[PDB]
Design an enzyme around this catalytic site. Structure first.
Site, PDB file in Angstrom:
ATOM      1  N   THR B  33       0.833  -1.194   0.100  1.00  0.00           N
ATOM      2  CA  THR B  33      -0.054   0.264  -0.033  1.00  0.00           C
ATOM      3  C   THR B  33       0.789   1.275  -0.212  1.00  0.00           C
ATOM      4  OG1 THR B  33      -0.214   0.297   2.387  1.00  0.00           O
ATOM      5  CG2 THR B  33      -1.812  -1.086   1.406  1.00  0.00           C
ATOM      6  N   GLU B  37       4.261   7.945  -0.408  1.00  0.00           N
ATOM      7  CA  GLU B  37       5.316   7.807   0.408  1.00  0.00           C
ATOM      8  C   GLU B  37       6.666   8.325  -0.796  1.00  0.00           C
ATOM      9  N   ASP B  80      -2.159   4.307  -4.142  1.00  0.00           N
ATOM     10  CA  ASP B  80      -3.562   4.858  -4.057  1.00  0.00           C
ATOM     11  C   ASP B  80      -3.634   6.300  -4.547  1.00  0.00           C
ATOM     12  OD1 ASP B  80      -5.676   5.672  -0.804  1.00  0.00           O
ATOM     13  OD2 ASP B  80      -5.970   5.935  -2.925  1.00  0.00           O
ATOM     14  N   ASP B 278      -9.514  -3.704   9.124  1.00  0.00           N
ATOM     15  CA  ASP B 278      -8.532  -4.923   9.181  1.00  0.00           C
ATOM     16  C   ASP B 278      -8.518  -5.439  10.512  1.00  0.00           C
TER      17      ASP B 278
HETATM   18  O1  LIG Z   1      -5.270   7.286   4.596  1.00  0.00           O
HETATM   19  C1  LIG Z   1      -4.811   6.568   4.236  1.00  0.00           C
HETATM   20  C2  LIG Z   1      -3.826   5.721   5.350  1.00  0.00           C
HETATM   21  C3  LIG Z   1      -2.956   4.680   4.964  1.00  0.00           C
HETATM   22  N1  LIG Z   1      -2.769   4.554   3.574  1.00  0.00           N
HETATM   23  C4  LIG Z   1      -1.867   3.516   3.118  1.00  0.00           C
HETATM   24  O2  LIG Z   1      -1.384   2.980   4.343  1.00  0.00           O
HETATM   25  C5  LIG Z   1       0.020   3.304   4.539  1.00  0.00           C
HETATM   26  C6  LIG Z   1       0.058   3.650   5.901  1.00  0.00           C
HETATM   27  O3  LIG Z   1       0.256   4.834   6.200  1.00  0.00           O
HETATM   28  P1  LIG Z   1       1.399   5.827   7.124  1.00  0.00           P
HETATM   29  O4  LIG Z   1       2.354   4.506   7.388  1.00  0.00           O
HETATM   30  O5  LIG Z   1       2.050   6.759   6.629  1.00  0.00           O
HETATM   31  O6  LIG Z   1       0.661   6.179   8.134  1.00  0.00           O
HETATM   32  P2  LIG Z   1      -0.561   5.316   9.180  1.00  0.00           P
HETATM   33  O7  LIG Z   1      -1.564   5.379   8.103  1.00  0.00           O
HETATM   34  O8  LIG Z   1      -0.197   3.847   9.149  1.00  0.00           O
HETATM   35  O9  LIG Z   1      -0.715   6.044  10.394  1.00  0.00           O
HETATM   36  C7  LIG Z   1       0.386   4.588   3.620  1.00  0.00           C
HETATM   37  O10 LIG Z   1       1.917   4.542   3.222  1.00  0.00           O
HETATM   38  C8  LIG Z   1      -0.653   4.155   2.350  1.00  0.00           C
HETATM   39  O11 LIG Z   1       0.179   3.019   1.663  1.00  0.00           O
HETATM   40  C9  LIG Z   1      -3.486   5.500   2.469  1.00  0.00           C
HETATM   41  O12 LIG Z   1      -3.085   5.061   1.398  1.00  0.00           O
HETATM   42  N2  LIG Z   1      -4.400   6.136   2.934  1.00  0.00           N
HETATM   43 MG   LIG Z   2       3.238   6.009   4.069  1.00  0.00          MG
END
Ligand SMILES: O=c1ccn([C@@H]2O[C@H](COP(=O)(O)OP(=O)(O)O)[C@@H](O)[C@H]2O)c(=O)[nH]1
Ligand SMILES: [Mg+2]
Ligand SMILES: CCCCCCCC/C=C\CCCCCCCC(=O)O[C@@H](COC(=O)CCCCCCCCCCCCCCC)COP(=O)([O-])OCC[N+](C)(C)C
Ligand SMILES: CCCCCCCC/C=C\CCCCCCCC(=O)O[C@@H](COC(=O)CCCCCCCCCCCCCCC)COP(=O)([O-])OCC[N+](C)(C)C
Ligand SMILES: O=c1ccn([C@@H]2O[C@H](COP(=O)(O)OP(=O)(O)O)[C@@H](O)[C@H]2O)c(=O)[nH]1
Ligand SMILES: CC(=O)N[C@@H]1[C@@H](O)[C@H](O)[C@@H](CO)O[C@H]1O
Ligand SMILES: CC(=O)N[C@@H]1[C@@H](O)[C@H](O)[C@@H](CO)O[C@H]1O
Ligand SMILES: [Mg+2]
Ligand SMILES: [Mg+2]
Ligand SMILES: [Mg+2]
Lengths: 597, 597
Positions: B33, B37, B80, B278
């Site tokens: 995902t 990034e 995404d 999830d």
């Molecule tokens: O609104 C969101 C949250 C998450 N992600 C995906 O899930 C990963 C997790 O995001 P990140 O590690 O930056 O922060 P987290 O969402 O885990 O707090 C991202 O890199 C994306 O690939 C996304 O596409 N949209």
């Molecule tokens: Mg990320």
């Protein structure tokens, strides 16, 4: 012939009166602000206005008015947004022959003389000017068009502001005009009555009878007191009048464009003066350089308004008023020094300094209102609970817990939620606060008879002696306080929603929103923390813990502290002082008017 | 040859593996995902993955893997939103030969073997599937495409989920695969390490060393404890794997479409299960009808993640986690009865009932966390202030007033403001809470030595004995608690912002927003009032007033109440019980793994 004009440039770059063989004089210009009012609402104002011109024309002994009085009045209908307007009222205006801006000017020889519950009758002059906007803008834009625009085309001697849905009296507007024969006057307004409905029916909606005693006594006390000194806080938007030559120049400029001297970054005033609208004109007119302008309030003229009758829209309306009064008072006080830079005579300068201090005093009270009500309620409940005991102690924690749940819910619903969406909870909150008021009144009377009573009787008698002096005392039994149970909800539910929503955010624009969010969230914490410093000097917030610990250093905490009685008798002494000042102002107004007459 | 496919219909109506002479087997599918990034971030995951396939291919003694192991792995890169993507990473993927949906499939014979601070080197197989979306949708949509779509094309034996910016170990993914050789397993995951930076430099950012001890000990304790019983709370989104045949059917349906049985009006669950993402798959797989699926956690596989290093984005990230855990735990507990409707053997059924009760117990603790921290802080400060006296009493009211100002400001900034806009105030809030933690630790040690110490030593020793057992104890001196001063800010600033922002509103859609606003503003008031009922049983909220008044009926209030010590020793007894349970779970996991090996 019917004409039409489509304005395209702002008012700064921008009437029939000037377009005439003999230059007509705008001895008075009436501005009708209509957003999406019902046909009956906007029709009410125009219906009330007609009668006024009828009176102005059938007079005999007058140098200015007479059989030709109809020429020297121009009625401008400033409509805010065509898309949201109701076509019913437009059909009404078309029956009159009257229907980035549009301009309609016509002379209606027909008059609307009957308005039933749903039917309005027309039968067979009035110079109408129906100004219709293209796209919705804040009312300040409509005032911009009124003042930057059609004023300098017309060159009005006077400019009067009306709202669609407000009833100018049988003879109000002429009495309003009669104020400016005195050369030192700069502005005047008329008293506003509430529409209690046929046979005083709307006196049922507890709110319509809570805003009634809130309009009747405001007009009886505040307008007269302020007009005695020379500077009236608010020319009410419903029905007010300014001499054009007074407002002309600096006051218009600083009311429209904001404080001119500004850098790229935002400061407090130059970036927060939008809250106080139509309250800056008064300041910049009264304290004008090398001018001695005065503001007066005309009693012999009245206008009866419509009021919202359900609690959500009530709160949405009063949040504007509270923020406007706060920001206007803070600004006008923090610039009190230029009162002495004006053209006022020394007596006038001293009077205006005193009155500006008086208004800032009043706003300083309205800022500590929240803590004042909490301590009045809490000390009043604990007092009965600590002498009556019995079911009052359980009712003390019960009402405390109810007050706490309702108040915390009010913060959370104001910060996160909207009023329309949670209606039944607001109705329940208002009923809880109303039964809390019944409980406080019960405690008052019970403790008094078993033994504050002097002060309460004195303030009520001042109300009554002043209300009768004003010749409008029936309201004091028209439910008034009986329906003022909404007052608890005035002090808490309206202030909480007002300061919790200072800036009305809607997430150059993004930095603007961020700065406004910070200022909003900072005035909220100052409100809460200053009120709670007052509360904590009850000795909440670990202050009683601190004193107990100090005593231990060399015990246990007490339940009541004299600071509450001192703060309880100071509050009553202070409100009695305010009522006494307002009653004296009204008495002087009446004596002067009667002697002059 | 390089191919491309542009999906146009949702996954329900919708790979190269199936398009082959001999049907390839998706023995494992890795889902990457990526939102926006950095090139280095997404590159890190693909770099870590390669090494995994290298290990899988150079093995010798294996029936499933070998020199032909590269065929039976498919790496799907689910991106995404093209508009928000960074073209740097796309150039990176194009160098690999890899660059309403797009689908890119290529076989890269080149491997990325060097990644410096800014340079990534390519030298000269991996079956890549770069899935690019058209328009930004929530990650749940990407999972929809992964499961409703390419799963049934590929028919995976296993599906593994990765995030761009996460480092699969030198040998992690193979160890993850080795879990599903046991037929009763349904899901598995890998431990997540924090990137403390070259020479443990990022161990400086106090946050990067506060999330480090928060990831290291979470993987040491919670995953092993939950995997012993059979149902792991969260397969972490960074690195997790589900058998397809287990999830297939009911769990996918109720994870995607929500609870099927629903009327037009909204109910609690069917309209609030989006919060827990999830985390529903685990429930609907483990308690499946006529199935005995188990969830296990694979220690021998690790992935090292990137962490946000400034306080705003930290809070924005953890607000998702807190809400997800709450809603998932409440739902899965309120449906614990169908555990007994499954195909589990009676021992398995009893184990899973016990563990579901254990998770709901943990969530019941995390809901009273706010009041627990306030009473621990407040009783700990008042205790020293009521025995040490001296500068502690002033520091008691000072820290109380600082705690009150910071907490009230946290509510007001969470409800009305945004975190990015007020950054320095959050940094100051975190520093204030950190010095508060220093003060509480100071009080702890001072009072202990002058005389809780047994319990604190016991829990720290359980941490240390378990951490060393896990073979990763250096973190406990890598600043860990020294940098866990952010913990005060974990309990208060993260929970306040989490529950004050349950639904992430953005004002069919309007009624949806109104209902969500009401549910949000109602869970907030229940949070506050239930926590404050705990607080008030300290005897705040007029409860001490009530007792004093009752005593008067037949005095004055006391400063401390045994209810605080009972609530103080219960809290420590309870956290020690949780630590003991988690240590036992980890010990059993280790003994079983070592015996089996
Ligand atoms: O609104 C969101 C949250 C998450 N992600 C995906 O899930 C990963 C997790 O995001 P990140 O590690 O930056 O922060 P987290 O969402 O885990 O707090 C991202 O890199 C994306 O690939 C996304 O596409 N949209
Ligand atoms: Mg990320
Ligand atoms: C309430 C329960 C509701 C629970 C719901 C939600 C819990 C909210 C957490 C705070 C609860 C504190 C409870 C408390 O001690 O009340 C005490 C203080 O009285 C107050 O402080 C008035 C505050 C009104 C309720 C605050 C909720 C609104 C938050 C924003 C409000 C902005 C506040 C601005 C206006 C004050 C009661 O006063 P007392 O007992 O006479 O103290 C005398 C001290 N003595 C005994 C040592 C002599
Ligand atoms: C604070 C000043 C900051 C001013 C800023 C803003 C003023 C806010 C108005 C309420 C102030 C109440 C002050 C008060 O009495 O504190 C008291 C209660 O301790 C608490 O009630 C904890 C509340 C934390 C501060 C509340 C602000 C956040 C509102 C939402 C928070 C959600 C609350 C959920 C977590 C609790 C202190 O405890 P105590 O003195 O030991 O009482 C012992 C009673 N006894 C003496 C009879 C034995
Ligand atoms: O946002 C606003 C507020 C007010 N008005 C005008 O000012 C009048 C006053 O509105 P109303 O009496 O309904 O409520 P108030 O605004 O005084 O609370 C309206 O009828 C409009 O003519 C407007 O156009 N837009
Ligand atoms: C300070 C204050 O209350 N000002 C209001 C004003 O905003 C309102 O327009 C008018 C009637 O509409 O009544 C005045 O009392
Ligand atoms: C309950 C909980 O904290 N779950 C989180 C999960 O949301 C997160 O995706 C994962 C690593 O990214 O770590 C888990 O601990
Ligand atoms: Mg209106
Ligand atoms: Mg109106
Ligand atoms: Mg990440």
């Amino acid at each position: 012939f019917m004409r039409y004009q489509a304005v395209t440039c702002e008012p700064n770059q921008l009437v029939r009166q000037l377009k005439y063989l003999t230059p007509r004089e705008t001895e008075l210009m009436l501005v009708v602000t209509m957003y999406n009012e019902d046909h009956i609402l906007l029709g009410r104002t125009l219906k009330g206005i007609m009668d006024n011109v009828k009176y102005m024309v059938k007079k005999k002994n007058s140098s200015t008015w007479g059989p030709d009085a109809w020429k020297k009045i121009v009625v401008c209908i400033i409509s805010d947004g065509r898309s949201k307007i109701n076509e019913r009222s437009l059909a009404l205006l078309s029956s009159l022959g009257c229907y980035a801006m549009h301009v309609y000017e016509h002379t209606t020889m027909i008059n609307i003389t009957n308005i039933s519950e749903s039917e309005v009758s027309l039968e067979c002059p009035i110079q109408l000017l129906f100004c219709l906007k293209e796209q919705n803008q804040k009312k300040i834009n409509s005032h911009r068009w009124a003042f930057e625009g059609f004023a300098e085309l017309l060159r009005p001697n006077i400019v009067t502001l009306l709202d669609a849905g407000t009833m100018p009296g049988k003879d109000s507007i002429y009495q309003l005009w009669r104020e400016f024969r005195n050369p030192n006057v700069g502005g005047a307004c008329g008293e506003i009555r509430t529409d209690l409905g046929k046979r005083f029916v709307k006196l049922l909606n507890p709110l319509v009878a809570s805003q009634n005693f809130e309009y009747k006594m405001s007009n009886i006390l505040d307008k007269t007191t302020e007009s005695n000194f020379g500077f009236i806080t608010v020319l009410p938007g419903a029905f007010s009048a300014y001499r054009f030559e007074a407002v002309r120049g600096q006051p218009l400029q600083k009311y429209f464009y904001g404080e001119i001297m500004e850098n790229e970054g935002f400061h407090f005033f130059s970036s927060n003066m939008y809250l106080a609208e139509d309250r800056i004109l008064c300041f910049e007119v009264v304290t004008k350089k090398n001018c001695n302008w005065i503001l007066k309030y005309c009693r012999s003229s009245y206008a009866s308004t419509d009021v919202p009758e359900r609690v959500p829209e009530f709160i949405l309306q009063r949040r504007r008023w509270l923020n406007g009064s706060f920001f206007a008072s803070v600004y006008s006080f923090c610039h009190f020094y230029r009162v002495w830079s004006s053209g006022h005579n020394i007596g006038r300068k001293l009077l205006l300094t005193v009155e500006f201090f008086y208004l800032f005093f009043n706003t300083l009270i309205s800022w500590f209102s929240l803590s004042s009500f909490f301590l009045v309620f809490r000390i009043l409940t604990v007092s009965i609970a600590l002498a009556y005991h019995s079911a009052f102690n359980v009712l003390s924690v019960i009402f405390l817990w109810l007050y706490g749940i309702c108040t915390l819910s009010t913060f959370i619903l104001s910060l996160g939620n909207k009023p329309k969406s949670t209606e039944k909870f607001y109705v329940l909150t208002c009923v809880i606060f109303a039964v809390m008021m019944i409980y406080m009144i019960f405690c008052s009377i019970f403790m008094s008879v078993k033994s504050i009573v002097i002060s309460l009787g004195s303030t009520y008698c001042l109300y009554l002696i002043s209300s009768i002096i004003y010749l409008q005392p029936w309201h004091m039994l028209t439910s008034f306080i009986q329906y003022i149970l909404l007052s608890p909800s005035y002090i808490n539910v309206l202030n909480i929603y007002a300061f919790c929503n200072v800036h009305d955010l809607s997430w150059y624009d993004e930095k603007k929103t961020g700065y406004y969010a910070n200022v909003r969230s900072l005035v909220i914490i100052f409100w809460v923390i200053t009120n709670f410093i007052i509360v904590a000097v009850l000795e909440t917030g670990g202050i009683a813990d601190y004193i107990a610990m100090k005593s231990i250093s060399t015990a246990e905490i007490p339940l009541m502290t004299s600071k509450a009685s001192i703060y309880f008798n100071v509050i009553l002494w202070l409100v009695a002082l305010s009522a006494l000042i307002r009653f004296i102002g009204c008495s002087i107004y009446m004596i002067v008017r009667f002697f002059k007459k």
